[PDB]
Each structure stands twice: as structure tokens, then as C-alpha cells.
Amino acid sequence: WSVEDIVKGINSNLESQLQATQAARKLLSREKQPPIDNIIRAGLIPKFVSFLGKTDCSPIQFESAWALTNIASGTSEQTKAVVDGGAIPAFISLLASPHAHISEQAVWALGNIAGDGSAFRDLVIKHGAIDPLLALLAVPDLSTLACGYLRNLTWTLSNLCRNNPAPPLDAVEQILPTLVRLLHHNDPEVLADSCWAISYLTDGPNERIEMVVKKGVVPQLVKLLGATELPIVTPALRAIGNIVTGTDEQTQKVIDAGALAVFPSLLTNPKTNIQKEATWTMSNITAGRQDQIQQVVNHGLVPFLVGVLSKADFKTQKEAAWAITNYTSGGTVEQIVYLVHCGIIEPLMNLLSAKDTKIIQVILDAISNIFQAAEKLGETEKLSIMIEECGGLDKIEALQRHNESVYKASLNLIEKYFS
């Protein structure tokens, strides 16, 4: 239909209204550029918001809820148009409908509104949205509820966990216990958004990381870390990666839960984003205590990092360089020279042909601290020859006339070990 014909019917006013609003919903579901902006300009949102209230006529409720859901899926200004029409409390009222498909539609719409950003998220929370949403999940068996219904509640819950400033502590504390239950329910999509919700909560001050970790979720997170569904592995690795940016005791909980045994598959995972985030998390584990570095050693992960450093897309090679410089900064003399036995030298020397000023210095820091270990064991002469034979000395020799801070770092290696 055209928008004009819809307006004659909404303002004809009850049997006529449903067909026209129904007609609006079909128009707003169309594939290419549903004409969202003209429906707002025609003034139809206040009637649609009015439409959520005909407890008598559930059909006009559902259609208006659907039309409004799909206006709120658009730009921030279009979402703003929905909120400005009063939809939040009307949708919150609709969560309690005895008709399951209408309750879900309100859940979905509320998910779109909260997903726009931190201001709309907190405003939805301020209206009292958390309790009736959680009240819907307060069943003895989560497999009691329709599968599609449960998926939206989890998704809607995850957008309430998302995003400067963070959600009020009370909201995260209040929603979280239902989140842990959902993290164990056997549906692949529910799990993904549970991990997403958990992934959001662990990005921030160590007090927030600490909070999720108390609930015993880390063993389960490492389990999803090994799932075959990529939509599950992706958020699980993000959540684990955030946790290992924290303190030494939180990092010990991830290792002890068995996370490292999954990393041979992850650091060779053919999905570019999986391999890089696994390399980044390794960079934060190798920034830990010496007993945790030997545990990466014990799990055999050094050959895998030499492999990523040797051949991967360029951004991971930079992530591995941090893992290596971190390893060489905190490790024992034996652990660092063990790097040399594993073949660390050639892919490092090959990577120094790169012109980015920043990574050159990261690689050179690793090389000097490694030489200092060689100094303690009396093996510097073996290493100097090793660096020269794979072409590393020429490159190092060439960096004196290449940022000047890179150049003075390169000369120092030359004066001390190649004179």
C-alpha cells in the first residue's frame, strides 16, 4: 500500500484501523528501504503507541508492536522517535500479556531500544524493565518455554549488559544469577548471547571481572571455548580474553580450569578473528608470573606461537611479538633461552624488515633481554652467530640509518654483541 491510504484508515476509527496498521507492518517488513521516515512524518507513532493499549483487541496490539519493533530497528533518530512517543512503559506493560507472542514482541522491541546505547539502556532500566523480564524466566525448567521466546529474552538481556558508563551495579548483580543458568542451557544461540552478556561484563575494572568469576563460570567458559560452533567460540574467547587481563589470581582460575589445552586448535584456527584474539590472550598470560610462564611452556604452546609469528596475517604477528616481549621480560633465564631452542629467532628476524616504527622496537626489546639471558649462561657467542646467519645482523645493521629511538636500540645490540 501507499502511506496515504494507511493514514485514511488509521484515522477512520476500529475494524478499519487494524487492516491499515496491519498493512503498515507488512510495508515495514519489506526487504529494501522500508519507508520508516515517512511513517514517522505522517504522525503514526503516537497511534501505534496508543495501539499497544487495546487489551480488548489483541490483533491491533500485535501489529502495532511489530510495526514499532521494526521502526526501532533503524537509526538512533528513528529509535528516538519510538521512545519519544511513549513506547517504553507501554511495552513494559505488555510483557505481562497472557498471549505469548505479544509478550515476546514487547521483549524484542525493548531489546532494540536498549541496544541503541547507554542512555536508552539505562532509561529502559529506570522504567522497571528488569524484574518483569526476569519474572518471565523464573521457571523450574527453562526448557518449559518456547525456544524462540527464550532466545529473545537472552538477547534482550545481553543488550542490557552492554556498553561508558557501565550498567548500574545493582542491575548487573540482579540479572546475573539468571544469566549463569542460561549459560548452561542446551541451545546454541542462547549460549552465544549468554557468552556475549558475560563478555560485556568482564570488560572494565578488575572489580567487574572479579564479580563474574565468583559465580564459577570459568570452567564452563573454557568448555564453550572448545565448542565446534563458531558463533559460540567467538564470544567465549572474548570473555576468557578479558578475564586474563586482570590480576594474577583471576588468571590462575582460567589456567586451572584447563583453558590452555584448547589453544593448539585456537592458534591454528582458520577463522582470522579467532586466531588473533587467542594470540592476544596469550600475550596477557605471558605478562604474568614465572610459574604461569612455565605452564605455557609445559602445555607446549611456545611452538604454536613461533608458528603464528612465522606465518599469519600481519596483525597477529604483531600480537605474537607482544606475547614474546612479555615472555622475555618476566621469564626465568632457562625459559627465555628455551624460546631460542624452539626456533624463535628466525621468524623474529624476518619480521624486522617491516617499516612500522612501533613493532620494530617491540621486537628489539625481546632480542636484548634474550641476549642478557645468553650473557648469564655464557652462550652469547652462539646466539650472535645465529642472528647473523639468518640475515638478522644486516637488518639490525640497517636499522641504524632507518624513528631515532629505534636506531639507538639497534646500535646497542651491535656494540655489545657484534664487535
Partner: peptide, 28 residues
């Protein structure tokens, strides 16, 4: 030192994965 996600995402974005923000209903 440990480096938090903002620094990683700042190094690597655009394109860092995240969950769905909005969904359009075509179904039902």
C-alpha cells in the same frame, strides 16, 4: 603489563566482532 580490550580494539578496529545490536522482524 596487562593491556585491556579497548587497546586491542583500538589497535585492530574496524571489524572486531560483537553481538547483534538491532534485529528486523520479517518472520511469523
Amino acid at each position: 603489563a596487562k593491556k585491556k580490550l579497548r587497546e586491542y580494539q583500538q589497535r585492530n578496529s574496524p571489524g572486531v566482532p560483537t553481538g547483534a545490536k538491532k534485529k528486523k522482524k520479517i518472520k511469523n
